[PDB]
Amino acid sequence: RTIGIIGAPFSKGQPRGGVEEGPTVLRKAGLLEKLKEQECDVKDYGDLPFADIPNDSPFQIVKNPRSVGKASEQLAGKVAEVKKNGRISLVLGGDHSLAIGSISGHARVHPDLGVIWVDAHTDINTPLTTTSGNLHGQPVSFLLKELKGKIPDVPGFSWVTPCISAKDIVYIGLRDVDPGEHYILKTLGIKYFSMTEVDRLGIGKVMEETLSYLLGRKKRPIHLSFDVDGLDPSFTPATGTPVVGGLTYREGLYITEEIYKTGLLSGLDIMEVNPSLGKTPEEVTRTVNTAVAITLACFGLAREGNHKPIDYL
Amino acid sequence: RTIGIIGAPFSKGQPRGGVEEGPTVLRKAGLLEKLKEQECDVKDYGDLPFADIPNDSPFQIVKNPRSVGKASEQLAGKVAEVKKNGRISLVLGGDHSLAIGSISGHARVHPDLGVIWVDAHTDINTPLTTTSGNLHGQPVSFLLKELKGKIPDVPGFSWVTPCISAKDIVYIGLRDVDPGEHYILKTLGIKYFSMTEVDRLGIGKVMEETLSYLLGRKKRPIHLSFDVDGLDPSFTPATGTPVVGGLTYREGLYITEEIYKTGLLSGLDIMEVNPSLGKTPEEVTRTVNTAVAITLACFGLAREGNHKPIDYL
Amino acid sequence: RTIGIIGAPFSKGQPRGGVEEGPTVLRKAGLLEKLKEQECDVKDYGDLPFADIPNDSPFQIVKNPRSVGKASEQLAGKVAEVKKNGRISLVLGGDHSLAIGSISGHARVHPDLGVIWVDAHTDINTPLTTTSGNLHGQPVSFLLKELKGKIPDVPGFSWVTPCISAKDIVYIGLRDVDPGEHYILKTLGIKYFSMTEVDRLGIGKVMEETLSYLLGRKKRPIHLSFDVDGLDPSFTPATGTPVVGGLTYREGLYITEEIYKTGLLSGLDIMEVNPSLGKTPEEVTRTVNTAVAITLACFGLAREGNHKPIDYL
Ligand SMILES: N[C@@H](CCCC[NH3+])C(=O)O
Ligand SMILES: N[C@@H](CCCC[NH3+])C(=O)O
Ligand SMILES: N[C@@H](CCCC[NH3+])C(=O)O
Ligand SMILES: [Mn+2]
Ligand SMILES: [Mn+2]
Numbered sequence: 006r007t008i009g010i011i012g013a014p015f016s017k018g019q020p021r022g023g024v025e026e027g028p029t030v031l032r033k034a035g036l037l038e039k040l041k042e043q044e045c046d047v048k049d050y051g052d053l054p055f056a057d058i059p060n061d062s063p064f065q066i067v068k069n070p071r072s073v074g075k076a077s078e079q080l081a082g083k084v085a086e087v088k089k090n091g092r093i094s095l096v097l098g099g100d101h102s103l104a105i106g107s108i109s110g111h112a113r114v115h116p117d118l119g120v121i122w123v124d125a126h127t128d129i130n131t132p133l134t135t136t137s138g139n140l141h142g143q144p145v146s147f148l149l150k151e152l153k154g155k156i157p158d159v160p161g162f163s164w165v166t167p168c169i170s171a172k173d174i175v176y177i178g179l180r181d182v183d184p185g186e187h188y189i190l191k192t193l194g195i196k197y198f199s200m201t202e203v204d205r206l207g208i209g210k211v212m213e214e215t216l217s218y219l220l221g222r223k224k225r226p227i228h229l230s231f232d233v234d235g236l237d238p239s240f241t242p243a244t245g246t247p248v249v250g251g252l253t254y255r256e257g258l259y260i261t262e263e264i265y266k267t268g269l270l271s272g273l274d275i276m277e278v279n280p281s282l283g284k285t286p287e288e289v290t291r292t293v294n295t296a297v298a299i300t301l302a303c304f305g306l307a308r309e310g311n312h313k314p315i316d317y318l
Numbered sequence: 319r320t321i322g323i324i325g326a327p328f329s330k331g332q333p334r335g336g337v338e339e340g341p342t343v344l345r346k347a348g349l350l351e352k353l354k355e356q357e358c359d360v361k362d363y364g365d366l367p368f369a370d371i372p373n374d375s376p377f378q379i380v381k382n383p384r385s386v387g388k389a390s391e392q393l394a395g396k397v398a399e400v401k402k403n404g405r406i407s408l409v410l411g412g413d414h415s416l417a418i419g420s421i422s423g424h425a426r427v428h429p430d431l432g433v434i435w436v437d438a439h440t441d442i443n444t445p446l447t448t449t450s451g452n453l454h455g456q457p458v459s460f461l462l463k464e465l466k467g468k469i470p471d472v473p474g475f476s477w478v479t480p481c482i483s484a485k486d487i488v489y490i491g492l493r494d495v496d497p498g499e500h501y502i503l504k505t506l507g508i509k510y511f512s513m514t515e516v517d518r519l520g521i522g523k524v525m526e527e528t529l530s531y532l533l534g535r536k537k538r539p540i541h542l543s544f545d546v547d548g549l550d551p552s553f554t555p556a557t558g559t560p561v562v563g564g565l566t567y568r569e570g571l572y573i574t575e576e577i578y579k580t581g582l583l584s585g586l587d588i589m590e591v592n593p594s595l596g597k598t599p600e601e602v603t604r605t606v607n608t609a610v611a612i613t614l615a616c617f618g619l620a621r622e623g624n625h626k627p628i629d630y631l
Numbered sequence: 632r633t634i635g636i637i638g639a640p641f642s643k644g645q646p647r648g649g650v651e652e653g654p655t656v657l658r659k660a661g662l663l664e665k666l667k668e669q670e671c672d673v674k675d676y677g678d679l680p681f682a683d684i685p686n687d688s689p690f691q692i693v694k695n696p697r698s699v700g701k702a703s704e705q706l707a708g709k710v711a712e713v714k715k716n717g718r719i720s721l722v723l724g725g726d727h728s729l730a731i732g733s734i735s736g737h738a739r740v741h742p743d744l745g746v747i748w749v750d751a752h753t754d755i756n757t758p759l760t761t762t763s764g765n766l767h768g769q770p771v772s773f774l775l776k777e778l779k780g781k782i783p784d785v786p787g788f789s790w791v792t793p794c795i796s797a798k799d800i801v802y803i804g805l806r807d808v809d810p811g812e813h814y815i816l817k818t819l820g821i822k823y824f825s826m827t828e829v830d831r832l833g834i835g836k837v838m839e840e841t842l843s844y845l846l847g848r849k850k851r852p853i854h855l856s857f858d859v860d861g862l863d864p865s866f867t868p869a870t871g872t873p874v875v876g877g878l879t880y881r882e883g884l885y886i887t888e889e890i891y892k893t894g895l896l897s898g899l900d901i902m903e904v905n906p907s908l909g910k911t912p913e914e915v916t917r918t919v920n921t922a923v924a925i926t927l928a929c930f931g932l933a934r935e936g937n938h939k940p941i942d943y944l
């Protein structure tokens with residue numbers, strides 16, 4: 006469809022820095038050209054400038070709360086802009102803490118959006134349940150309204166307003182969920198398909214239930230937050246928190262091909278691609294190649310082929 | 319069943335030459351002995367002699383049309399021979415352009431045959447829609463009757479007669495289909511199961527629908543044209559046009575085990591094995607080992623075991 | 632649940648020796664600590680002392696019958712002990728010949744047990760049908776009552792009493808079954824899901840049918856004999872008899888997560904882990920890492936997460 010690309014070179018949501026290079030390598034792989042090579046009206050809003058916030062001491066256990074809170078605030082406004090421009094926002098990260106601004110900004114122009122979260126983790130720890138202190142593992146806790154009250158006033162997020170309900174989101178691919186996170190999942194009744202459910206039903210039924218769950222009552226704009234560590238590390242090794250037994254390349258593409266076909270995709274996140282973590286230059290291209298493949302699927306690239314409304318014979 | 323092996327060391331359907339070695343390595347892996355190690359009456363018709371055709375300038379964009387047209391013509395007669403001998407023709411390639419002669423020759427003794435095409439591609443470009451000019455990506459266009467009129471008189475194929483309908487064939491494993499090819503697929507209503515449908519239904523349902531589709535109305539001889547690049551390159555890397563996200567080793571064997579059980583297998587093609595393309599000697603044996611495994615399945619080798627009609631206790 | 636760990640450093644059921652190290656590396660990977668890190672009351676009964684039996688000439692074709700028969704006899708008593716202690720026996724092997732003592736000892740305190748055998752092989756050759764002579768490929772033949780009469784008096788097993796029926800066991804993952812073994816399977820009507828049935832139905836339906844088959848008539852204690860070569864060698868390479876096209880890591884965990892949820896697991900076997908066979912130190916840790924993962928699943932570790940009966944918010 007009509008795309009609005011925005012680069013988000015941010016890494017302060019976690020320890021390993023090379024993730025802020027994601028935009029660079031994803032663009033070098035020729036993402037723009039590839040998109041344009043389709044029914045895509047592409048406008049790159051460039052890379053957001055994430056100014057240094059030198060004085061950002063931990064809030065209790067939470068690290069770099071201000072630079073994170075700031076990076077998400079800046080992105081929220083940018084996403085809202087591209088949406089007001091009638092364009093599908095494509096945010097290239099950058100660590101997953103940015104989802105806070107991406108989804109918030111999306112919910113401003115489209116408060117009825119539905120979220121599909123592909124990840125190996127649920128990223129729903131609260132500033133109080135997290136043990137690591139890394140904000141790229143808490144983005145979800147800031148957006149849920151039902152958790153409005155368990156989120157302390159962390160410096161940098163006083164602009165945040167929970168914008169989604171526990172039932173407006175579906176997780177797919179989970180395989181490393183903390184105890185407090187699992188508790189929250191069962192308590193708020195969050196719909197999820199861990200790797201156990203994917204193995205059980207098959208990726209087809211999984212998506213069928215997902216789209217039906219989020220679009221059942223009525224059609225709403227869709228937001229896909231794709232963490233690359235959601236796929237098995239044999240496909241996307243250059244990422245910070247890899248977990249074996251992930252979604253295959255095929256399941257990765259099947260999810261996006263299906264979402265694309267809904268025609269309701271309005272927001273997309275490609276997160277956690279960290280080139281510095283590749284053990285070899287091949288693991289690096291293998292990660293970026295895969296991250297690009299999943300992106301092109303979101304916008305039309307089908308494995309059975311594509312063709313223009315013309316007579317080829 | 320009763321087999322008729324024929325070697326087809328041909329490569330002129332494409333650029334990379336080492337594919338004409340397929341017969342050699344497939345036999346060195348001990349294919350004959352393996353087959354004989356079963357309920358197989360094996361007769362090797364040797365390797366066809368593909369005489370040099372030095373004067374073979376391109377026909378427009380089409381490369382080596384005469385040597386290709388000749389190689390397929392020679393094979394067609396050989397396959398017809400082994401079939402008239404009441405034997406399941408097993409053609410070891412060689413690039414996929416040979417399918418033209420294999421299927422044509424098969425259709426002479428068994429004009430009612432049904433075709434199952436396992437490949438990452440549809441190989442249905444016409445001399446006019448192809449952009450590469452490589453004939454191993456156009457074999458299908460010469461055999462379909464509905465395309466009788468969109469195929470120009472290319473030097474070397476005036477012996478060709480479309481022998482199959484758009485509904486006598488089922489593709490399985492597609493993941494890199496050109497635009498003109500996709501157009502033809504939807505226009506002639508060709509039945510196909512790209513990697514998207516395999517992921518959706520599961521390999522079991524896929525085959526179930528395939529066999530039911532081709533054998534529904536009535537039982538007919540079956541022709542299986544297996545391109546090794548149909549399977550994921552992690553299993554068959556030594557091939558010319560590999561595409562990630564392919565059929566697994568297991569799905570590869572499940573397809574053949576199922577076809578075998580139909581008891582209607584009459585023609586088999588093992589194509590695109592190119593040893594020169596192996597990055598290591600292991601990728602080479604890994605490709606040939608896999609190509610052999612799929613062949614033995616076609617003739618009885620079952621993963622649950624096999625035993626002779628005797629009392630082992 | 633409440634566990635009773637027993638080390639079984641035995642290798643005389645086959646040729647390659649490094650398998651008797653299994654207990655050592657599985658414990659070094661910190662298995663005990665991991666188990667304890669759950670709702671597990673763990674008591675390690677140490678490693679059984681498998682005294683040397685220098686004079687153990689082959690019985691016809693059968694190798695090391697006395698040391699094998701002795702090792703299984705010793706284990707049977709140890710398993711019976713831990714069971715009488717109201718604990719789920721967790722036997723770390725060691726080659727698969729030990730299953731004879733593990734299952735026998737289990738059947739003493741729980742004669743109504745049901746067996747689930749995950750392996751690439753059926754290990755049901757008789758001292759008379761085996762061609763290799765290796766007892767780790769015959770454990771099943773000594774336990775079936777219906778085969779009481781086809782088992783010659785092999786030195787070291789006069790203590791053995793067939794303790795299970797042909798219908799009290801279900802095989803999962805088969806892909807290399809001898810002819811005599813296949814004959815026995817079809818003759819005694821043994822329920823099995825080779826890799827062909829897993830591909831067909833999907834791992835979910837497979838387990839569903841398995842648990843329903845063994846628990847259909849009524850709930851009974853379950854014995855899971857897990858051979859690591861059951862999983863594809865890309866996950867567990869450090870094992871003696873690897874076969875490509877195995878169960879994935881995911882299917883490996885799905886099987887155990889499901890069994891765990893039955894709540895009827897009473898006996899568990901982790902066999903064939905041979906560190907000496909790793910081609911690299913990574914294949915070694917990759918094998919042991921995987922062998923540990925499947926073990927923790929058996930006792931509660933779920934991929935969707937876990938949490939204590941408390942309020943995390
Ligand atoms: N759930 C863990 C890991 C998060 C990884 C995010 N990329 C945490 O809260 O730190
Ligand atoms: N479809 C492409 C690739 C074909 C590859 C065949 N092995 C073409 O027409 O050239
Ligand atoms: N079935 C073969 C192989 C067994 C492998 C056991 N780990 C035999 O009887 O020797
Ligand atoms: Mn993650
Ligand atoms: Mn994430």
Ligand SMILES: [Mn+2]
Nearest residue numbers: 437438439547
């Ligand atoms: Mn192909």
Ligand SMILES: [Mn+2]
Nearest residue numbers: 414437441545
């Ligand atoms: Mn082909």
Ligand SMILES: [Mn+2]
Nearest residue numbers: 750751752860
């Ligand atoms: Mn085995």
Ligand SMILES: [Mn+2]
Nearest residue numbers: 727750754858
């Ligand atoms: Mn075994």
